[PDB]
Structure formats: C-alpha cells, structure tokens
C-alpha cells in the first residue's frame, strides 16, 4: 500500500514518471467493480478503506481503518512492540499520504502553502518541503518552489513537450528504416 | 410559405414511391424536420409499412414510436413536421387524403402534406407538391418546395456521372 | 409590452393610469419608459404621483428615489411588497445610466449607487435581468465592470450595424 | 470480392447522420444494407447507430441493430445487412474489433468509411473486408483488405441526383460553441494530457517496431489540437 | 433450515452461515433440474414456494444481524427471484421485517436511493398494520423517509455534456440490477424520489422543520441567508427526542448536499473570490475540510476551479485566455436569450 499508492496516484495524475506495483492492488480493483460495497469487515477490506482514504487525502481515516480491519484480525496485536509500530506507521503513512494528496490535487491547485499543509498533515515543514522537492525533481514535474516565501507552483513547457515528441517520432522512423533494409 | 426539402428526404420519397409503384400499393411516410419561422425544413423522412387500410388509420403507432426512438439514438432528433404520400389521382381527385391531414393538423397546426407522383416523375421533371388546409371556400392550398443542400452534399452528389460548425454558425 | 401598454393607456379610463404605471414599473421586461411618459394622458398634472413615478423610472436613479421617498409611495410599496420588484428595476436602471456615461465602471462607484455589498455586487450584476440589459466582463482583480424613444433610436442604429457584421461572417463561411 | 459500388443515397445518409450532431471531433457509425452475394458488393442503403467510444473501448447498441434491421426487412427484404460504416476519415484502431461484432449479424463483415468532410475529391468512400494473409510458421494475423469503390445509381436515384444538381449544372450549434469555449478556457491541462498521449502513441509504435494502439493515440491527440484551433 | 439459521446467529458462526447459504443455493438449482425428474419438489405449488421464500427471508435477516453485508446483498436477490415466482403473498409481518432489513443494507451499501425506497415500502406496509397504530411512529418514520431523500447525493446532470455524450456520473453502479429488482420501472433521480416525499401523506406525518428545510434548500436557496435559516432551524431538531434521532444519522450527507449547493451557487456568483471569503461564506467543520469539499465538488464536475494557494484566492473558470473564453461563454448566453426573446415578440406582433 505505502509503496504503490503514491505511484498509482501520480499515474492518476498521468505524469507517469515511473511505474510501480502495489500488493493487494488486484483485490482493490475487484472491490471497485463489485455490485455491492459494504463497510469493511475482513482485514483486506480495512486495508482497502485505508487506501481509498489515502487517495482522497484523509490520513486520519486511513489510520483509523487499519485498526478496524486489524481489530477483527488481531493482526497488529500479535507483536510485542505494537505501540511503537503504530506510531511509526502513523508517521510513514502521514508522509506517503501527503505525497498522494499532492499528486492527485496538483491539477486544480496552481499554488500551495507549506505552513497550512504542514499543520494539516501534522508533518513539520522540514519533512514537507523535502518530500515535495525530492518528488518533483525525481518525476520531472513542472512545479516551482520558493523557499523564501514557502510557496509552490504548477499547471504548466508546451514548447519543450513538443520537442520531446519530435525526438520520439525520429526514433520510430529510424526503426522503420531498419525493416526496410 | 416554403417547404425546404433535403437531399436524403427527396431521394427517400422518390425511392419509396417507386418501390411502392412496383408494389401497386400506395406508399406513405412521415416527414421529420423543423418549423422555422413560417418556413418548414424537411431534413429526413421515413416510410410507414403498407396497410390493408386505405388513407387514414394507415399509420402504425407502434412502428412509429420504435422508429422515432431508434432515430433519436441517431443524431437528427427532429419533430414530425408532416407526412408524404404517393397518390395517382389528379388533379385533387380524392377527398379521403385530406381528412388524414386534418388529423395531422390537430396534432400540430403547422403540419404539411407532401404528395409525390413516382410514375409521372421523369428525368428533368419531379412531380411533387406540398399542401396545407385553409384556416364557398376551398379546403387546401399549395406552397412551393425548394431544396436545401450543403456544400458537402453537393460534392457528394456529383460522384454520380463524375466524369457542421459552419452550419451552426449560419 | 410598450405596444400593449400604450394601447391600453389610450383606451382605458384615466383612473386606470395609476395602476398601469405600477404595472409598467413592475414589469420584468420593461426598461424604457419615455414613450409611456410622453403619452398625452400620462402628461396630465393631476396624476402627480404617476408623473413623479414616470420621472423616477424614466429619468432617475436609485439615489433620486431615496431623495424623494417621502413624496412617493415608498411606504405603500413596503406595505405591498411591490417595491422590491420596483426596487430591483430602479437599481437595474441605475446600472444602465452609469453604463451610458462610461464603459468601465468601478466597483466602488457601483456599490455607492448600488447601495449593496461589493461581494453581493457581482451577484446583482450576475442576475439575468441585468445580463439581458447588459453584456460585460467582470474583472475581480481590477474591481471593475467593463460594459460595452431616444435610446431606441441609438439601439436601432446599432442593430443595423450588427446585421452588417453578421452578414460578413456568414459571407466568409459561405465562401469556405 | 473484387469491388464495391455505393449508391449516392448512402453517401448523403452518412453525411446527414454526421450533420445532425454537429461535432467535428465526433465520428458517427452505422449499418450498411445492400447485396454482398457476388464479387461486386452493392451498397444501396444504410441507417445510423447509437455509438459511443471511451478510451480503447466502444459501445454499440446490439438491440438497436436488431430492432431497426427488423423494420428494414419489413420495408424491403432485398436490402440485406452487409456491414457497417463510419465517418473516419481513416481506419481507427478499434475497427477490426468492431467489425468482429458486425460479423454476428452477417459475414464476411464489410466496412465502408465515408469521409463526410470530403478532403479528397476522388473518393468519399473507402471499402474494406477483414482477412489475414498469414505468416508461415506462425498463426495468421487479421487485417483489412482494401477494395476498389465506385459510385453507381439505379435509374430512380440517377434521375433524383440529376434533378438535384440541375441549377449547378441552431441552438444545438450554439451549445457546441459554448462547449468549445469551455474547452478553450481549460486547454492548458488538456494540452499537457495530449502531450503525454502523443508520447504514449510513439512508445507503442516503438514496441511494434501495440504499434497500432500508439498510432491511434497520436491521431487522437492531433484531432484534439485541430478541434482546439477550429474553436479559436 | 430455520433451526440451522438460528444456530448460526446464536453462536456467531459466520463462516458456516455463508456455507449454509451456498448449500441452499445448490439445493434450489437442483430442483429445476429435479422437476423434470420424477418426485421433484413442485416450484409451481404455492405452499412449496412459501416455505422456500420464508427460508430466504430469514437468510437475509441473519445476514444483516451478523453484519455480513455482501452476503446480505446476495440473499436479497435470492429473495427477489423467489418473490417473482411467488403466487401467494407473504405474511405482512415477515414482509415488513424484510423491508426494514433492506433499509439497513442500503444504508451500509451507500445506495441512498434504494435506502429511501425500502423505507417507503415499509411505511406503506406499516400503515396498514397494525390496523390501529401509534401516531408518534408515523411522525418519526415519515420524517426519516423525507430527510433521507433530501440527504441524497445530488443527481444533477450537466446539460452541455449530456447532449454530446449522454454522459453523467463516473459513471458506474454495480448495484444497478437492484432497482429493477424492487419493482421500480427504472432508476430514479433524487428530485423524482422527493416528489413522493412532496406528496401529502409523507408530508402530513412529516415533522414541519423538514418541510421548511426542503424549502430552504430545494425551493428558494439563497447563500446570503441559508446559514441563518439553518441556524434557526437546527435548534428545533436537537430539542426533539424523535426528530433529533432521525436527524442525527443524516447530518453528514445533508451537510454534503447543502455545501455542494453553496459551492455551485458561489461558482455562479463569483469569478475569483478570496479563500477567506469563500470558506467564510459557507459553514464548514474545519477550514481545511471546506477546501476538501470544494475540490471534491470539482472532481465530480459540479464546479470548475483553480485554487491559488499563494494569494489565497479561488477562481471559477493564460489569464487573458481564461477571460476571453469567459466572455465568449457570456456572449453565447446573451445570444440565446435574444433569440428566445425574438420568439416572444413574434407573439406580441399578433396582439
């Protein structure tokens, strides 16, 4: 979940910088195509609800659901350190959910506030700015951050994109030439 | 008053009448289109099946409803603006045809009756007319029919013997 | 509607003119009152209240009503609830007066003449009666509204020009 | 089959079908009727179909085919269901799959593309039947065979066409314009998603050298750009 | 069978209950095959069916009580298919319990239209029985039914899109068969369902506050006054023991509907409104939850927005481009109005 969700979301974003596979992804797909959607009972359904909650950007809901799926399962109760892992997972989920949020909502948002985002994801700014900048640089996202005012920018580039397309076309042509030969 | 008849409407009416003529059974159908201003646009038609019944009561409302619904999935989605028939008798021989028109007029007072003659229609001479009832007086009168074709349609028609945004704006 | 009202004014008893004036000034499609005001029956001094209403709806703004409210049936309008339909119309007519003088209208000026909240202001501009009356572009960043018998004459001239323009466009299409 | 003849009515019917919607981007689909029992397929009538395309997938109304055909049969049993048409102007990626659907009604399926935009004067029609040449040592692969077309008319229609060419010899549209304006007021995001799509198509082609899919995507992107220009 | 199901409920044997149900399915499939064979149970006979139907009814009940909702939904169609074959009517007692179960299933299912339908089916059936019945229940049930219909997610479909593609929603609903399954001629809209709510019998026993709410939101909705009206109306519901109970469980969807309407109306009123003002204009649980709602409304295409977090402003549409196509869209509307007006004038000409 933690691994494949932000990469899925981005794909939903359609930036498609990288492709990632997340376990239990197939099960989630089956649920979506299900005629009936019940409130979670089996553990995979609690995990599932946590996933969709991550998609919509409610991290609190997601954290809640894992316990709810877990409680019937007793899955997290079988570890001696369970508290520690609860808080640790709470943090990692905070991070990845912040990522997911940013991925899905960058379409309609041209600009952002690191202070508000920091408070609302319960993630200190040092983490926020880091995650966002890292990701943007890694995915080649047309996004710009002013560290001084702590603000972000998106929704752009056209000229560059066209240049890329041209390159691809050239490649295809070369291939055809091979066959012709 | 003017009835504008489209390319497919005119060709379907001539085709159907001639097919009807081989049958020896009179052919009727419905005209689809738009009442614009006084003027009426006939953009398409469809044939009604041959009935044992003559003139009025010929119409099959189950056939009509099915055909209209299936066309609607089709783009045109156009009001029934009247009916066409092929009737041999001339001139103005039959009383019975007119009453049909009264039924159409009661449904929609703007309705038009077109009559085509598939036997006397010959190259250089289409024999067709369009009528409405009058509102010692005569019962009905005839309005001349013009033809509307797009530039695309004109090019298409020229393949015989070959040797959308715009329309909206207009 | 002007036709129907003029025909009625010139056939009905003079006693029916006050009600006709209330009807005209409450009618959703009517913004021009000059032809009605100019009617000889309309002209008469005795229907002083009616004449005042005509001046108010033919020539004045919302401000002019406020100035004269103690001598016009503002109170009667309040009792009736007629005024709000009338109040709305006078505010619409005020926008028309402003647009005659200037094709760019600052929000601050409108609000004072409007006597309405700036946030609301756009809503009032937004409302359809206003839209039919006026076509304009709202500039929130610059806080302005760009709004590009006597009036009828001018309108006529415009219409003629408009037709010519449309013809040009059609001609081009026909060519293609 | 060696060749195809098409009646002028079919050309005009396809154009009329396309015209009512008033969509440049949209491609309309329907049924053709006539006689395919000889080496010359004669296309003599047609009717429109409800049709929608989402992504690769497209929906055709099977019940509509059966119900309209049944009425056609009551008018004239001589005009058999022999294939389908669309407004093109070119073969599309989904066409071999759509063609497999029409095969159920009749076989072999025949596809008439009617270029209702009429970019090329010589042909308003391209005709195809599905067949596979095959590869030795490998399973046969389906493909469209291009058949020559001519426009021909029975006497009735000849008379009709000559009569029509004698002199030579809006709310929906407004709504469409509004939609175009809305697209324009949004085109910065649709640009960036058409840039990606274009790249995708290129990728597909590369794989082929999938290729067809990529090509289709590229075409779609181009179409979307053209529609943006027309709106402007 | 009845004994077996009671066993499953009493000992929470959920895994076995599911298997029990499947066994019952296999048994019934056999009978149709069996019927051709001699000595087969006669699915033509009413007593035989009444027994089978009675079992499936209980299957639905236990399913709900064991919170096995997916199994519940499967058992509902099991029940449905038997009712179609059914000649003799079921006991209204056992039938009303059935509908009272469907309301729970569909509340959990998130299918609010089916939820309200099931409520209505139960109300129509509980009105008859008891022959003498409490009026205090008719009060709360009718109110519940009505509130659940106001509380339904907006069914509105865009005009521009529909003509071109006839497309609305995501769109996909795997519980679509169920509408046909409830003897409904077709899936309804919330406006349609409401009209039944609109009808006096639902209205007559309906608490007054809800009728007012319906006015405030569905009849004459004005953002500049909605907050006040709701503030004065919400006190009354809380005080009532029964009204509050009906109300407590619909707070969320109701709030969603109201806020959706506020966002749409603000989209109509403004072009670029301050984030402070927009959030301020419509009440929210939290400022950030309000932003969440606004984006959700945008994704479901009830509004198009661009949110600039830098300046704290929201725009309901590069800058000049967005103004140009807004102008075009205004001009178009103006033309339409003029055209329509001309038509009206034609009539005046005759006068």
PDB file of C-alpha atoms in Angstrom, chain D residues 9 27 66-67 70 98 119 156 158 173 185 209 229:
ATOM      1  CA  UNK D   9     -28.160   7.906 -51.110  1.00  0.00           C
ATOM      2  CA  UNK D  27     -17.140  10.163 -35.699  1.00  0.00           C
ATOM      3  CA  UNK D  66     -31.757  -5.983 -34.400  1.00  0.00           C
ATOM      4  CA  UNK D  67     -34.791  -3.784 -33.949  1.00  0.00           C
ATOM      5  CA  UNK D  70     -36.299  -5.914 -38.432  1.00  0.00           C
ATOM      6  CA  UNK D  98     -15.919  -3.514 -34.020  1.00  0.00           C
ATOM      7  CA  UNK D 119     -10.996  16.225 -48.023  1.00  0.00           C
ATOM      8  CA  UNK D 156     -34.517   6.279 -59.798  1.00  0.00           C
ATOM      9  CA  UNK D 158     -29.801   8.834 -61.173  1.00  0.00           C
ATOM     10  CA  UNK D 173     -24.783  24.597 -32.606  1.00  0.00           C
ATOM     11  CA  UNK D 185     -10.951  28.075 -21.009  1.00  0.00           C
ATOM     12  CA  UNK D 209       8.997  -1.960 -34.460  1.00  0.00           C
ATOM     13  CA  UNK D 229      -7.725  25.532 -33.431  1.00  0.00           C
TER      14      UNK D 229
END
